[PDB]
Amino acid sequence: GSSGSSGTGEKPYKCDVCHKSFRYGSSLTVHQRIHTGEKPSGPSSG
Ligand SMILES: [Zn+2]
């Protein structure tokens, strides 16, 4: 559960809404799918 990213962490493609890193650009977009269309998810603000 605690943080623990050995190497894999700083990805060239990181979401700009949830901050989800992605070693590949395609992966990022394919993920943002949830950010587009249906209500957003994840932490936003207090
Ligand atoms: Zn995202």
SS3 sequence, the chain?
Answer: CCCCCCCCCCCCEECCCCCCEECCHHHHHHHHCCCCCCCCCCCCCC
Structural domain including 7 reads 1-46
User: What is the 36 CA–ligand 1 centroid distance (Å)?
Assistant: 10
**Dihedral sign (CA 35, 39, 45, 46):** negative
User: What is the 34 CA–ligand 1 centroid distance (Å)?
Assistant: 7
**Pair of tokens at residue 35:** 């950010």
Angle at 6 between CA 3 and CA 10, to 5 degrees: 85
Give me the number of domains the chain comprises: 1
User: What is the 32 CA–ligand 1 centroid distance (Å)?
Assistant: 5
